[PDB]
Amino acid sequence: HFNCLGMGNRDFIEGASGATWVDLVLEGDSCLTIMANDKPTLDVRMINIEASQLAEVRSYCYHASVTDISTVARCPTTGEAHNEKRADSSYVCKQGFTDRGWGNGCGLFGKGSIDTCAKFSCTSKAIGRTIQPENIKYEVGIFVHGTTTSENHGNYSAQVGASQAAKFTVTPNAPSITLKLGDYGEVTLDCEPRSGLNTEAFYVMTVGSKSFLVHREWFHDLALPWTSPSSTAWRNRELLMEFEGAHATKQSVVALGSQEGGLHQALAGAIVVEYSSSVKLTSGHLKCRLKMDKLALKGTTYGMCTEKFSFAKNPADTGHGTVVIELSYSGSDGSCKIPIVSVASLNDMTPVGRLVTVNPFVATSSANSKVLVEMEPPFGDSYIVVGRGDKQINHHWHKAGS
């Protein structure tokens, strides 16, 4: 998806009268149509963002498993108990004391030392990763509103074969690019990619099948056990475990409940990203300058088409205050310019609309060729009028207000 027709989110920019630069902000779910006097109309849209080489930072356990409990006890005054599970890193251990006497195995009375261990296993974890900024790629599409049909308007191969479209990537290393556009000229797009998706504010956090963009702030004060690529064991395991009251030589150890639910109140509540060895997202923005001084019109030279047109597709509402039609030209004198205006009444044929497809034309000498035309009609009732004199055709159009 590289141009605007059919997109549900669309914005219209009026380039200044005679300006050589145009500032843009490309919304990742949107499309810009830029119009300016004496210039062909352009669509530009941010297609997606891409980051490839993600480093790992830290993982959090939100559901722990407590298994294989064991206690070593000692009689009062005989020293500190040492449980040998302390030589095993997957065990968490805590010292303690219990009441001891003749009734539970000791010859003296008083506090006897105990050492209780339990195995800590992680059952499900949220793993966070980092994007280095040198590895973000913005995919951007550009389209110039030349001759198109209903079928090929969104076909990328057709439009790039007619030199009317380009997909290109901008990176922090290559923030500018010039593309040629056939006899329409060229445009240069100068972007700001490191200040588009600020990779220093965020982590990518994979939870099960999905991943998210999370504030590093929130990711750091997660009161959960954690690991990192180089660490030997889970750390701070104890905030998912309860050492229960010790009695003689026994002590119970349980895990707390899963925090899986409590992790989904956050991330509600966060930007989803597609993750498959490389992270893809369409949400986001890119700030660009578009240079248009070497962009010029093609057409103007040509004569007007002489023969009758017909409506190959009746006008349809595009959803953004414009209507799109497809014409069929019965004539053979192409290449010729299409006579198409928007009039408010058929007796007062003063033009009142405005063409989005500026300078629409039939490119070929073949008869019954099809041309698509996008127009911005005035509010209320109007007519789309194609052709002159007895070759003329019209279609009523209504554009509602509210």
Numbering used by the authors: 0 to 401
Authors' own words:
The overall crystal structures of JEV SA14 and SA14-14-2 E proteins were determined at a resolution of 2.2 Å and 2.1 Å, respectively, by molecular replacement methods. Structural comparison between JEV SA14 and SA14-14-2 E protein ectodomains revealed a rotation of DI and DIII relative to DII. Interestingly, the side chain of JEV SA14 Lys279 protrudes to the bulk solvent whereas that of JEV SA14-14-2 Met279 is directed to the protein interior. Accordingly, JEV SA14-14-2 monomer provides a plausible dimer (complexation significance score (CSS), 1.00) with a nearly two-fold axis while JEV SA14 monomer cannot pack to a reliable dimer (CSS, 0.00). The area and hydrophobicity of the DII fusion loop-DIII interface of JEV SA14 dimer is decreased with the fusion loop slightly shifting away from the hydrophobic cavity in comparison with that of JEV SA14-14-2 dimer. All together, the smaller overall contact area and number of interactions and the requirement of significant rearrangements argue for a weaker monomer-monomer affinity of JEV SA14 compared to JEV SA14-14-2 E protein dimer. Due to the different DI to DII orientation of the monomer, the distance between the same residue 104 of the fusion loop increases from 25.2 Å in JEV SA14 to 46.5 Å in JEV SA14-14-2 trimers, respectively. The three elongated DII domains are tightly packed in JEV SA14 trimers and separately arranged in JEV SA14-14-2 trimers. Only in the compact JEV SA14 trimer assembly, the three conserved residues Trp101, Leu107 and Phe108 of the fusion loop form a bowl-like hydrophobic cavity.
